[PDB]
Each structure stands twice: as C-alpha cells, then as structure tokens.
C-alpha cells in the first residue's frame, strides 16, 4: 500500500540514520586536535588572466597542470597557458550561455554545456588549425551544471532535470542515466580512479553513484540548502560539498556519514566552488563574498583568505600537481594563486 | 629569451584583438529576456517581432541588433540560472490576458511576475510586458464579467476598465519602484507595431541607463 510503503521507507531511513550514528565513536575534530594547525598561509596572485569580457562560470586545470580552460558568458571559452598568461585557443560557443567546462585528461578535447542543455565537445588537436566541435551531446531535459571527462571517449554530465548521464562521445548517446535525485544536480566530481563519482543537487544531498552500473551507492544528507559544488579528498574515500547556506562539509565514503563542517559565524553567503590541495590537508572554498577562504580540512580552523576578486568567485580549481590554485569570478578576471 | 614564445605571444595578441572586437560589437546589441507565462502567445509575438533549452531569436530593427532570449522551455529551479541574465537591457513579459477564467492562470502569471520583477538580480532591468490576446480578452469579458478572476474588482465590465485594472495590478506588483519603470503594451494589433514599441522602449531604457551612468539621475 502507498501509506504502508511510505512508513516502511521512513522506518528504513530511521534504521539507516541510527546505524550510521552508532558507527561514530569519536568525531574528526577530537582526533585531529592533537596535530598542530597549518597556521596562516598567505598566497599571492602570481598571475591574473584577463581576457574575458563577461562573467566566467567555470574552468578546469589541465592534466599537465599548465593549461586551464575557462568559459564565460560572452560566448567564448579560452584555453589559457597559465605559466605565461598566453591564450592558446579562444573557442566561440554556438550558445553563449555556458555554465560549465571540462578539459579532457589527455588534453585533446574540451567540453562545455550551459543553458542550451547540450554538452558541446570541441576537439583541439585537429590537423586543421581551428578548433572543431567533435560532438554536441543532447538528451538532457534541463541545463547542464557540471560536465566532467572520464576519458577521451566517455563524459559524465549533470543536468537540471535531476539526473546525471554517462555519454559515450563516439556514439553521442547516453550509455547510463543515473536517476535518484529530486532536484537540480548542481555539481559533480569524479574519483581519482574514475570508478565512481558523486553528484550534489539542490535537494540538499550528495549521492555516490558507480558509473559501471549506474546506481546511487550511497546518499549523504546534512545540508540545509542547495549543494553548489563538490570535490573529493584526493584519497578518493571522502568528499567535501559546498552549499548555499554558507557551509561546506566533509563526508567520508567508508563510514558513509558526515565527518565535520566548516562554518564560520561571520559568513552567511553560499558557496560556489570547493577544492582540495594535492595533499588533501587544506580545503579551498569559493565564497560569493568576493573571496575564497582556505580552510584546514582536519580541524575546521580557517587558514587563509584569497581576497582579490571584485565579484563573486564562481569557479575554482587546484592544479593536479598542487602547485597553484586558480579562482575565477564574475568580474571576468581569473587569478592564479600559489 | 622567447625563442618561439614570441610567436605564441603574437597568436595570443591576435586572438585578444579578436575577443576585443567581438566584445565591442556585442556591446552594441541590446539583449532582451522573454519570460512569458506559458501558453501566453509567446510564439505569436516572437514571429511578429521577427518581422530543447533556450532559443535565441537574434534579429535587427532600425540598425539596432536585438538578441531575444526565450527561456520558457525550461522546467527547473529558476533561481539557479536566472542570475545568468544580469545586464539584459530589458525583460519582456507576456500575459494571456484572455486567460483570466482559465484554470486562476493569470494568478499564477502574477506570481511569476512578482517573483521575477523582485529578484535581487533584476533590481534595475526594466520590464516590457505585453497583455496578449486583447481581442479574445474583450470577447471573453463580454461573455462573463472579470469578477471571476478578481473578486475585489468594482467597475464596468468593459474592455477599457478591465484592461486598465489589469494593467494597474501588474504595475502594482513591482515592489522595487523608482528604479525600474515597466512599459505596458496590448499586443493584439496584427501589425508591425509590437517591435516598434519594443524599440522605442529599449531606447528609453538605454537613455535612462546612460544618464544614470553619466551622473544625471
């Protein structure tokens, strides 16, 4: 029956909650009190890449950690050479409304989505000079909030239709649609082994899927509002999710429950991006108070502030080798810090 | 020093010049956001003005390049992508004026108008609302009074009084007054006049923006 099914689901959820609570003897803060703090870390703006003439809503560092692709609403996504500030490509967009960006691990392709609901995949290493649209993946009922490259052949996209998809680029059709969310899937993040990713949606919950078969392996709650961004602890067994209630948490996959939360009283503004350092100790977080607060993902004590942006920081990314962190804000300037 | 990096910097400067030219020629194009209310004759006015996700109806009028952004065909959390539309020179609106008895529908349209006219993002962008289906609205009101859609209405059940009441109520919803004047039109004349109204209202919006930036208001 509908009522009996609903109450059975409710008691099953209560069992989930009590089981996960019983498997929590000491919080991360107590265990991490002994280790000394990271102190204060001051990182200057080594570079300020200024080519965009409108807001920039996303970027992604290259695998080599030198090329970063950044997409603005002026109809362009630019492939900056962060070391020298040069732009190696200025790809125009069929639809100027772009809300995501991705740079393929091999570096050949890039991808960008947006309000058009179409993830356009551009090919860079083409023997023609100009960047050509390798594919235009379509099939999402809503906008694309975040698309990430699994390989040069598979791309996982998160849309506003409350579902994720695993497009096979060659055939340009979904090979697996991840359902289970109840709101706009605002952000996505792949594992270091790329064997399973997570998606954070507007229903205030982050889901751990498994790309192989496409089922939500785990579900994490705790946030009181949207989840605007997620990243993994480089270990691949814990992920930190931003939110619109000015709080980024740290869930762990093995224990399958929230570990701790990074909320500071004088911040009332929603997150927009989250990232880790290559060591996973310090946690970047792009607040829309025009600056990103570098936390310490073992004690919650804030470790710094990279306040150098005129407008909201909408995209953030730590290089693969951890040598720099690039933050891009709605003022059209994205800055590299080190 | 810069063995062939000189050529790379030259390429960077070339595409930077291209970006600057594109930005300059895109700043001279007025961007309008067309919301509507669903089944509100958005397609009709789109076709008249022309002379999946969102459809951009780029067109030109009197050497002015309008870029009209129709986001009606998108069902999701509006607040998440609405902030993408800061700086749109105007926010066209559509109201199925004949849809006063439909169901209540105009009440949902009013709720949508209040939500989108008071968003923190659109605190300055003026709204150009068209009350479509004027003739059909006249016939419907002739058939039945307007009190069905508004129990508080107290006036003649004629086209003039009812249209004035609806126009007043739709101009009453913008709480953030004195910063965004909204222009109301009755898009039912099957002639090349709606685009003319959009043009002579966007020119007013541009003049207001210019004299605000220039420091004259």
């Amino acid at each position, epitope marked *: 029956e509908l009522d009996q099914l609903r109450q059975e689901a409710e008691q099953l959820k209560n069992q989930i909650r009590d089981a996960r609570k019983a498997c929590a003897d000491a919080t991360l803060s107590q265990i991490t009190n002994n280790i000394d703090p990271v102190g204060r870390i001051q990182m200057r703006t080594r570079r300020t890449l200024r080519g965009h003439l409108a807001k920039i809503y996303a970027m992604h560092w290259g695998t080599d950690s030198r090329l970063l692709v950044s997409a603005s609403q002026d109809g362009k996504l630019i492939i900056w050479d962060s070391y020298t500030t040069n732009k190696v490509h200025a790809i125009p967009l069929r639809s100027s409304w772009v809300m995501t960006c991705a740079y393929a691990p091999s570096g050949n392709y890039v991808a960008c989505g947006g309000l058009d609901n179409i993830c356009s995949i551009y090919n860079l*290493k083409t023997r023609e000079g100009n960047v050509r649209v390798s594919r235009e993946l379509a099939g999402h009922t809503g906008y694309l909030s975040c698309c990430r490259f699994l390989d040069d052949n598979q791309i996982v996209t998160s849309s506003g239709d409350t579902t994720c998809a695993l497009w096979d680029i060659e055939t340009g059709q979904q090979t697996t649609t991840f359902t289970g969310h109840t709101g706009d899937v605002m952000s996505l993040s792949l594992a270091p082994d790329t064997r399973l990713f997570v998606s954070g949606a507007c229903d205030a919950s982050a889901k751990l899927w498994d790309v192989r078969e496409g089922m939500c392996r785990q579900t994490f709650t705790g946030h009181e509002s949207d989840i605007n961004a997620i990243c993994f602890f480089p270990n691949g067994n814990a992920f930190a999710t931003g939110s619109d209630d000015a709080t980024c948490r740290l869930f762990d996959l093995r224990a399958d429950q929230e570990l701790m939360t990074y909320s500071h009283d004088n911040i009332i503004c929603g997150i927009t991006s989250v990232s880790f350092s290559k060591s996973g100790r310090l946690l970047l977080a792009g607040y829309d108070d025009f600056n990103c607060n570098v936390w310490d993902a073992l004690k919650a004590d804030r470790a710094g502030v990279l306040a150098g942006h005129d407008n909201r920081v909408s995209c953030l990314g730590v290089t693969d080798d951890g040598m720099a962190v690039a933050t891009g804000s709605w003022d059209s300037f994205l800055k590299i810090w080190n | 020093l810069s*063995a062939e990096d*000189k050529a790379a910097v030259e390429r960077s400067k*070339m595409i930077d010049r291209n970006l600057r030219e594109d930005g300059e020629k895109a700043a001279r194009e007025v961007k309008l956001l067309l919301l509507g209310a669903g089944e509100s004759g958005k397609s009709t006015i789109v076709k008249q003005m022309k002379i999946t996700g969102i459809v951009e109806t780029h067109f030109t009028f009197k050497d002015l390049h309008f870029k009209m952004f129709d986001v009606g065909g998108q069902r999701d959390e509006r607040k998440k992508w609405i902030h993408c539309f800061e700086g749109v020179t105007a926010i066209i609106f559509c109201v199925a004026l004949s849809d006063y008895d439909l169901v209540n529908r105009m009440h949902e349209s009013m709720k949508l108008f209040d939500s989108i006219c008071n968003n923190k993002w659109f605190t300055d962008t003026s709204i150009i609302l068209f009350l479509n289906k004027k003739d059909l609205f006249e016939e419907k009101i002739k058939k039945s009074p307007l009190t069905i859609c508004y129990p508080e209405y107290a006036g003649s059940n004629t086209y003039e009084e009812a249209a004035a009441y609806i126009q007043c109520q739709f101009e009453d919803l913008n709480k953030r007054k004195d910063t965004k004047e909204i222009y109301t039109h009755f898009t039912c004349s099957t002639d090349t006049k709606n685009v003319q109204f959009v043009f002579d209202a966007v020119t007013d919006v541009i003049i207001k923006n210019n004299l605000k930036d220039c420091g004259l208001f």
Partner: single-chain antibody, 232 residues
Framework: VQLVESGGGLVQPGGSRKLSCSASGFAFSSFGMHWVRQAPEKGLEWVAYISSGSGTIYYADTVKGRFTISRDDPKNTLFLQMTSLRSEDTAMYYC??????????????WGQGTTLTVSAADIVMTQATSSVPVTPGESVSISCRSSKSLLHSNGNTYLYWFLQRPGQSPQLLIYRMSNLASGVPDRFSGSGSGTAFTLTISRLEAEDVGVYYCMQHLEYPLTFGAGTKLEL
C-alpha cells in the same frame, strides 16, 4: 590539408618572379607560413617567414630585401615576390605550414614544391654522417651536433627532425627533440641534450629510407642541417 605551389620557370638571371602557395583544407588565416628552399643537390635552407596576420616577417640573411614575402588570407594564398635572381637561387621552394602555441606542431605540413631553375651570428648545425648503410629491420641512429645550446631557459629544446623520402616533400618527424608528429609511427625517438641530439629508429622499415634533416627553431634564421641520407 593541402598546399599547392606554382610560379616556377626558367627565369633569366637578375630578373624577377612571383611564387604562389594556395592553401586548402586548413584555416590558413591562423597558420604562420614559411618558405624554405632546397638546391637541386644540397640540403634544405630557410628562406622567409610570415606570422599569423602578417604581424611579423623574417627573411634569411642571404635573401634579405631581395625577396619580399606577403600573404592574403581572404584569397588563402601566400606570395613570394623575388627579384634579382642570381644563379644561387636555382632551388625548389617548399611552402611550410606552422602554428605556434604551447604544445603545437610547427612545420608539420610541407607543400609539394616548385622546381625553379635560374640560368647562369647564425647557428651552424652539423650532421656527423651523410650516408650510412641500413638493413631493412636493424635499428639505426642519426646524430645532430649544434653549436649554440638549444636547451632554452624554459625547458623547451627547440630542435626538429624532418624526413624527406626520395622524390617527395619532406615531412615533420619530431619536434622539440622528444615528440612525434601526428601520424608518425612510434618507432622514431628523439633524445640527447643541449648542443648534441640523436634520432633513433627502431625496427626500420623500407618506408623510412630517405634523408633526415636536423633543424633548430631557437632563433631566426632557422638553419637546417646537412642531411643524413639512408640507403638500403
């Protein structure tokens, strides 16, 4: 991608001539273009260069002023107007594509050449050997000894290896001394260090016999090598 060249004739010495390079397939506007000549018996030799948009132009010291090089993107053509043709310019001229961005493949595509007969501070780069006996299957090596160290301060060591099969247009094999041009078998490898470089061929096939030219790109003029011809 295709480059077709025309304008080769028996020009009287001291005269004038024009050489046209028509480009099809690729976005000729974004591609810088070099003109590289080759004497009937000698090795390659740089002639002229235009960047993208004609912003920068360079000429070899031996044709400076005499040869004026221009381009027209809308017509997709590259012109070389050359005047006062001494007997030393009786060379076939190749039209070489080149795109300069981080991780690019400059000099990747070469034109087909135009036979052109005329009636009667640099970086010297030496080739240790000019002719070696090669068995079809035995690995071989070729050495290129520069004079000025080519290991630029920013890691890049600009040294390209080109292959010219008999009766064909030379093609790019390796760029920056350790890479592979698209469509080149992995058998080719590049190694060494600044001022001494090596190209190794493993499991040599019958399609590799030819002349291997060593080039540098540290600074113009881009003095080529003397060529190390292989044989069966």
């Amino acid at each position: 991608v295709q480059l077709v060249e025309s304008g080769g004739g028996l020009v009287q010495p001291g005269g004038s001539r024009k050489l046209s390079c028509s480009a099809s397939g690729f976005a000729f506007s974004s591609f810088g273009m070099h003109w590289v000549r080759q004497a009937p018996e000698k090795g390659l030799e740089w002639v002229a260069y235009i960047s993208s948009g004609s912003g920068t132009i360079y000429y070899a010291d031996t044709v400076k002023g005499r040869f004026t090089i221009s381009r027209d993107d809308p017509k997709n053509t590259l012109f070389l107007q050359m005047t006062s043709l001494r007997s030393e310019d009786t060379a076939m001229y190749y039209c070489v594509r080149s795109i300069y961005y981080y991780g690019s493949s400059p000099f990747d595509f070469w034109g087909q050449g135009t036979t052109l007969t005329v009636s009667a501070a640099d970086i010297v780069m030496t080739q240790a050997t000019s002719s070696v006996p090669v068995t079809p299957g035995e690995s071989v090596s070729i050495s290129c000894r520069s004079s000025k160290s080519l290991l630029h301060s920013n890691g890049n060591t600009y040294l390209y290896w080109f292959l010219q099969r008999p009766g064909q247009s030379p093609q790019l094999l390796i760029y920056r001394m350790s890479n592979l041009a698209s469509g080149v078998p992995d058998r080719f490898s590049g190694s060494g260090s600044g001022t001494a470089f090596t190209l190794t061929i493993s499991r040599l096939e019958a399609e590799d016999v030819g002349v291997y030219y060593c080039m540098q790109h540290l600074e113009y003029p881009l003095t080529f090598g003397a060529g190390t011809k292989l044989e069966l």
